[PDB]
Structure formats: structure tokens, C-alpha cells
């Protein structure tokens, strides 16, 4: 369960990076 | 560098999925 | 060109993987 | 939980279709 | 070759949508 | 809805073949 | 780079296939 | 079924990494 929580956190951080990357692409 | 950041984000998601896979594998005893 | 489409689609995929991940967590619990 | 997974799979499908469009454009220049 | 890959992704997308519909049906149970 | 899941798994396998052949084309 | 992206998407599809099959085996 | 889900997640992780490398290549020209 602890390792699942960490993985869900890493996924959120990655989605944020992708969001910022798409904004940079469109600007 | 927007493409580089999307790449890095995909790697971070990959790492996270692997950790979830490890957790589910433990649930399987 | 098509690079914008690919980047956009990869974000959708990533978002769908997040939902799948949380859905599995809810089932494991 | 199972419904969330399904919604995630549907979002992955949309993302794949967007990627398909990007490749199709690249294929045509 | 890009057109084939695009078509393949589109085909996987439809299969994922069909799988998704199936999970929602089981969820309703 | 087990029949729809089986059909989707088959659609994925079919799509997975088209990607393999497209990769081969690009490889050549 | 396009080749690598295609290969990765092929791998994702294969993994989603395994996930779907597992969920199916769980419901049954 | 839980093990197969974990294996599928791991395979997805591997595919995500390949996509990132392809994005890094395109970003470098």
C-alpha cells in the first residue's frame, strides 16, 4: 500500500510536468 | 524545451506505475 | 506538422493511466 | 473503482486517436 | 508505415472503448 | 459484459499487428 | 524518434491488453 | 488477475520510457 501511494504521487508530478511542457509548446 | 519536459513527465509516470505494480504484486503474496 | 497532436494525445493517455491507477487502488482497498 | 478504470481506458482511446491524427499528418508531410 | 501505425492505434482505441463498455456493464451488476 | 471485453481484446491484437507491420515498413 | 514513439505505444497497448485480461479474470 | 495487471503496468512503464527517448530525439532536431 505504501508503494502504491508513492507511485500515485509520482504520477501526479509527471502529469504536471506534461501540462507545463504543452504550454511551452503552445507559446 | 516543452518536448523535453513532457518526456521527463512520462518517465516520472513510468516510475510511478512500476511502484504501483510492485505494490499490487505484494497484494498477490 | 502533427507534433502538437502527439503531445496532446500523450497527455490524454497519461491522464487515463492516472484514472486507471486510482481505480485499481480503490479496488485494492 | 471499476467504472473509473473504464473512463480511463476511454481517455486513453481518445489520446490514441489524437496521436493517430498527428502521425497521419506527418505521413503527408 | 506511419499510416499503418495510425490505423493500428485507431483500432486499439476502439477495442479499448469496447473493453470499457464491458467494465461498466459488470460494474452495474 | 464479458462478450464485449473479449471482442475488444481481439481488436487490440488486430491493431497491434498493424503497428508491427508499419514498424517493419519504416525499418525498410 | 517517431520509431521509438511507435514502439512505446505498441508496448503500452500490450500492457493495457494484459490489464484488461486481468480485470476480466478478476470479475470471473 | 492482480499479477497480470501488475505486469501490464510494468510493460506500460517500459513503453512510456521509449516514448520519452523518441521525444528527446525530436527535441534535438
Numbering used by the authors:
A (entry chain H): 3 to 29
B (entry chain F), C (entry chain G): 1 to 29
D (entry chain E), E (entry chain B), H (entry chain R): 2 to 30
F (entry chain N), G (entry chain I): 2 to 29
Task: Quote the paper.
For targets with antiparallel helices, short loops are sufficient. However, targets with parallel helices require longer connectors; namely, an outer layer of helix–turn–helix–turn–helix motifs that are packed onto the barrels.
We solved high-resolution X-ray crystal structures of three peptides using ab initio phasing. Some plasticity in assemblies formed from these types of peptides is expected. Thus, it is possible that Ala-Leu-Ile-Ala and Gly-Leu-Ile-Ala can also access an open conformation in solution.
